Structure 1
Amino acid sequence: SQVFGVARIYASFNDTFVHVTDLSGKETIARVTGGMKVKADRDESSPYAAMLAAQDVAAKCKEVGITAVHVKIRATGGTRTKTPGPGGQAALRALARSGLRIGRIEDVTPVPSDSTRKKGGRRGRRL
């Protein structure tokens, strides 16, 4: 009854991606980011920008024919953050409110069994 895709919310810091794709992931549908919705070079990670981007992506999904999305949330991961940005939460809520059905929430943040040497030097960013 429902057509399932994948939601693929990448909430980094400084920006957020809402990437709706097919079940396989090869074919993409309306990848829209908060940088496409606001123009300040600093607000890409704003929850308002994330909500606007998610609303546009969900509208395009409903016009293409997608009814529900299996949600995969991820952060920058690797060696950098492992913590979702502020905008992924707003993106998920906006996708839920824009009429799309939501299924199978999953965190796919890339977590190493151990890392390459982290950026910043041993003493880190000294601000």
Structure 2
Amino acid sequence: DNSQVFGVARIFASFNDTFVHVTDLSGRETIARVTGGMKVKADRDESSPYAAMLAAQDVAAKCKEVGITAVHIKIRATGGTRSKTPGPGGQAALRALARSGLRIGRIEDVTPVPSDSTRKKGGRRGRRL
């Protein structure tokens, strides 16, 4: 084999402040919670594709530091109450992972899907912007 030290990407992407969070395959001991929100300035870009790329580069450096070589992608959208759709920058995130040395495998979308339960904060007529 290639003796790859498998990790998990566990991408957390939303309409605001996408997250990057690598850990063990189970998800026991977390590595580098640092998100894209830890690297951008004006709050324009908490969920920017560039914020995702910066977070991905930092966590790739961290993974090389620790020894993780293969990583498993678990992207996420909030689901439940909010839009069921991935954060905009998360795609760049994964791409920034791919270009940055680390091997990848077993991409998954753990974006929750509910059975039409509870309610979405909003009111009857909906968001009245």
TM over 0.5: yes
TM-superposition CA deviations, 1:28-59 (whole Å, max 9, x none): 11122111010212311110111011100111
Which structure shows the higher helix fraction?
Answer: 1
Partner in structure 2 of residue 34 of structure 1: 36
TM-score, length basis structure 2: 0.94
Q: What secondary structure, in the 3-state scheme, does the structure 1 residue paired with 2:55 have?
A: helix
Partner in structure 2 of residue 54 of structure 1: 56
Partner in structure 1 of residue 108 of structure 2: 106
Write the distance in 1 (CA, Å) between the matches of 2:14 and 2:21.
13
> Contact 2:12–2:77 (CA<8 Å) still a contact in 1?
yes
Q: Any stretches of 5+ residues in structure 1 without a counterpart?
A: none
Q: What secondary structure, in the 3-state scheme, does the structure 1 residue paired with 2:43 have?
A: coil
TM-superposition CA deviations, 1:64-92 (whole Å, max 9, x none): 11001111111111221110011110100
Deviation at 1:26, TM superposition (A): 1.3
> Contact 2:19–2:37 (CA<8 Å) still a contact in 1?
no
Deviation at 1:115, TM superposition (A): 1.9
Partner in structure 2 of residue 18 of structure 1: 20
> Contact 1:67–1:100 (CA<8 Å) still a contact in 2?
yes
Write the distance in 2 (CA, Å) between the matches of 1:106 and 1:17.
16
Write the distance in 2 (CA, Å) between the matches of 1:126 and 1:109.
27
Write the distance in 2 (CA, Å) between the matches of 1:42 and 1:119.
24
Deviation at 1:9, TM superposition (A): 0.4
Q: Any stretches of 5+ residues in structure 2 without a counterpart?
A: none
TM-superposition CA deviations, 1:92-114 (whole Å, max 9, x none): 00111111111011111011022
- Candidates 2, 8, 15, aligned match of 2:4: 2
> Contact 1:79–1:115 (CA<8 Å) still a contact in 2?
no
Write the distance in 2 (CA, Å) between the matches of 1:85 and 1:97.
20
Q: What secondary structure, in the 3-state scheme, does the structure 2 residue paired with 1:70 have?
A: strand
> How well do the aligned residues superpose, as a CA RMSD in angstroms?
0.9
